[PDB]
Amino acid sequence: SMEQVAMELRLTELTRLLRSVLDQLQDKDPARIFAQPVSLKEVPDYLDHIKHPMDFATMRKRLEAQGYKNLHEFEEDFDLIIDNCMKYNARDTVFYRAAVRLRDQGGVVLRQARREVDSIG
Predict the structure, then answer these.
(1) Where in or outside the cell?
(2) Residue among 32, 22, 105, 28 nearest 71 (CA)
(3) 67-72 contacts, C-beta under 8 A, 24 or more apart
(4) Rounded to an integer, what distance in angstroms lies between the CA atom of residue 49 and that of residue 66?
């Protein structure tokens, strides 16, 4: 159907916008602390602490399979990255501090993306 194609054109465009958002969020992590999943070889107990791990590479595979239906879902994944790190790592660590900084800097980018998703549809 033609409706299905137009739906898919909107999903595709949302995916275009989300990719740019992801790049801008990732630029706020120049240290690359959040680039890849936490290694279960190097942190064997990780899943006893964190039930839903998340990272930028895992978000990117979902993104490129058009697996984000809306900005809310994408934001849920970004918040997992931050929130997982703030639980596992203590306040005085470079990791915890890197999450706080990513959250603060990400807020601006996300604030405008919500306007652009409403605005363009």
Answers:
(1) Nucleus; Chromosome
(2) 22
(3) 68/14, 68/15, 68/18, 69/11, 70/14, 70/117, 71/14, 71/18, 71/113, 71/114, 71/117
(4) 29
Q: For residues 11 and 17, what is the distance between their CA atoms, to the nearest angstrom?
A: 10
CATH of 1-121, one of 3.40.50.150, 1.20.920.10, 1.10.260.40, 3.30.470.30: 1.20.920.10
Pairwise CA distance, residues 105 & 88, whole Å: 21
Other beta carbons within 10 angstroms of residue 53's beta carbon come to 16
CA–CA–CA angle 8, 9, 13 (5° rounding): 115
Can you tell me the distance from the alpha carbon of 101 to that of 115, in angstroms, rounded to the nearest whole number? 22
Q: What are phi and psi of 119, to 5 degrees?
A: -50, -65
Which tokens in the block code for residue 60? Answer: 């990117």
Helices 56-64 and 2-27: crossing angle in degrees, nearest 10, is: 160
The single-letter code of the amino acid at 110 is L
| Data resolution in angstroms | 2.1
Q: How was this structure determined?
A: X-ray
